Design a protein that fits this description.
- The protein is mainly alpha-helical and 581 residues long.
- It has one domain.
- Helix content is 59%, strand content 3%.
- A two-stranded antiparallel sheet has the order 1-2.
- It binds a molecule of 4 linked components (NAG-NAG-BMA-FUC), ligand K26, 2-acetamido-2-deoxy-beta-D-glucopyranose, chloride ion (CL) (2 copies) and zinc ion.
- The site of ligand K26 has 17 residues, from β4, α15 and α16.
Length: 581
Amino acid sequence: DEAEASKFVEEYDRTSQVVWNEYAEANWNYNTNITTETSKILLQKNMQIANHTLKYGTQARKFDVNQLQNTTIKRIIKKVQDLERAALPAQELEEYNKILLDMETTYSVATVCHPNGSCLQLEPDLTNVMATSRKYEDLLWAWEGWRDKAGRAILQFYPKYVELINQAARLNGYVDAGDSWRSMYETPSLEQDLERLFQELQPLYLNLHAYVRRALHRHYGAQHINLEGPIPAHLLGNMWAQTWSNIYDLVVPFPSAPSMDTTEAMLKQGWTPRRMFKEADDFFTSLGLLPVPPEFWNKSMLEKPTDGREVVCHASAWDFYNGKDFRIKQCTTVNLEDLVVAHHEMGHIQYFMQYKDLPVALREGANPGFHEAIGDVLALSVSTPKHLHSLNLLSSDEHDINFLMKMALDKIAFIPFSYLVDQWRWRVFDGSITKENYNQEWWSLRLKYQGLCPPVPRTQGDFDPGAKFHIPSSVPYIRYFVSFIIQFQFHEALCQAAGHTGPLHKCDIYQSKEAGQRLATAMKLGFSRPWPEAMQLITGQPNMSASAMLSYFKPLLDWLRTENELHGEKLGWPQYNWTPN
Ligand SMILES: *[C@@H]1O[C@H](CO[C@@H]2O[C@@H](C)[C@@H](O)[C@@H](O)[C@@H]2O)[C@@H](O[C@@H]2O[C@H](CO)[C@@H](O[C@@H]3O[C@H](CO)[C@@H](O)[C@H](O)[C@@H]3O)[C@H](O)[C@H]2NC(C)=O)[C@H](O)[C@H]1NC(C)=O
Ligand SMILES: CC[C@H](C)[C@H](NC(C)=O)C(=O)N[C@@H](Cc1ccc(O)cc1)C(=O)N[C@@H](Cc1ccc(O)cc1)P(=O)(O)O
Ligand SMILES: *[C@@H]1O[C@H](CO)[C@@H](O)[C@H](O)[C@H]1NC(C)=O
Ligand SMILES: [Cl-]
Ligand SMILES: [Cl-]
Ligand SMILES: [Zn+2]
């Protein structure tokens, strides 16, 4: 029984390489060239990969996993028994694939237009407005417009999507799609684990929220900001108020210690998207990690085409299942934000290259959070004033608190957002949230976790979750919450491995071969072992922990508490029922 099992795995892995490589090609071709033709080829390749999955999945289910000796074979066969969407009947499957395509296409081609003439796309036009405008009504136009055009358009598809993804989940042995998604972590205590981590970051978030709220009150006026209520969702510098770094200039702790305009610096010095990815490549190689192949530079789409082409702009990293072909697809803007994004995506590429010699079933991160965390770890060092000054993008305790605030606006603000997205989706999937209250429940969570309110009352027909990429694209989100916790654990451990002393936020692991080695050994494991092993290899312990993130921001927590107390802030939003009058 063991001999037939390993033979099966061998056959599965060699055939999967071929069909998945074919599928990836067609998917890439659509993502980088949205047309009726590339659509039809993709949907046809969807049938082909479903045929393969069904064939091998059906075989896999005939194995009694319980009777298998080898644990690696056991692990692979167990995973192949999950057919995903391929479990659906033929008619259901073609409908599901069409629904996903329609949702993705709708989101990626959505535009917000001025009556007079000009039509804005999310990247870069609406993103730029949200980042730079300091005018209440202009931010409102972009915020509401995006939700009116992208969000509302997704609503027609979503209930059927939910029905089909849940049906597929049940046919694969889960109770619903959220159950299926959570299972990717192989952690029965996941929901409690994440709840505890969220709670530990409360003091930091609430203090940041209160301080930022006070600064908004100062700029946007007392009539538009309730100092005891939620913050209007359009004022945080980001379409989804998920990260707040673009309003740094409104909240800077010590304006007497000014920072160099990084965007202006990058543009004047002739940075290009290509150069940004080259700098990311250099950072990885400085650690002794792998360079991207020449093929990467030849085949990647690192900027929005002027080709006339319609594309999916949202940054992604692609593994073509042949151990040679790895690509990034990103509509890169020349700014600091996208330089960080470039590092993030390059971390995904590094992961692909590190586990390329494993059987494809195990060519995944230790858990999806790990995959998201790699690039972010390096980006933490990239972001240090020391490293930015070395890149000629920047030029005391004041600057120190300023830096920590800047980092908090990104990292701390994202904690509740990244937590809530799948809190909402899991309840959609399990039936707790029906289509009659999709939006109402979304805003309940936006209030409960983030302390945000919508600037304009929502109406029936609104589907604000549809205005966030991962919703119509069916991309799980809890990975980003996990990523943000564990990236600081990795940072702390790699900094210690690099022999750095002093405050964690001052550490820069550039050129540390000891740091590179720890990351490499963990990444090489792919999905071959439960994630605590990869955690152990990097950090010397097996748990997720908020401690490293708390240690990193400790000096900011102290300053924020002092600042908030002297201004008499009431932390939180006890008047949670407050909305803009
Ligand atoms: C359980 O089975 C796994 C996997 O076995 C492999 O895949 C099967 C489908 C069959 O085709 C097998 O013939 C095949 O070995 C075993 O894990 C494997 O162990 C070997 C030996 O330790 C690893 O080989 C190493 O590979 C590196 C890089 O190529 C070399 O530098 C090393 O010197 C060494 O040869 C191999 O990588 C590893 N494979 C995986 C996927 O982990 C495992 O040993 C076995 N368990 C037991 C208890 O027997
Ligand atoms: C259609 C192929 C996918 C685009 C790709 N998968 C492969 C095998 O290439 C993939 O899942 N890539 C992940 C990063 C990631 C990669 C592998 C993982 O196991 C987990 C995450 C990725 O690019 N995520 C991005 C978001 C995204 C995720 C999935 C998508 O289909 C499109 C976009 P990011 O979080 O960097 O902004
Ligand atoms: C875009 O798609 C069309 C078919 O729809 C194809 O002929 C064309 O070559 C594609 N463009 C590029 C740049 O590949
Ligand atoms: Cl929203
Ligand atoms: Cl996930
Ligand atoms: Zn990512």
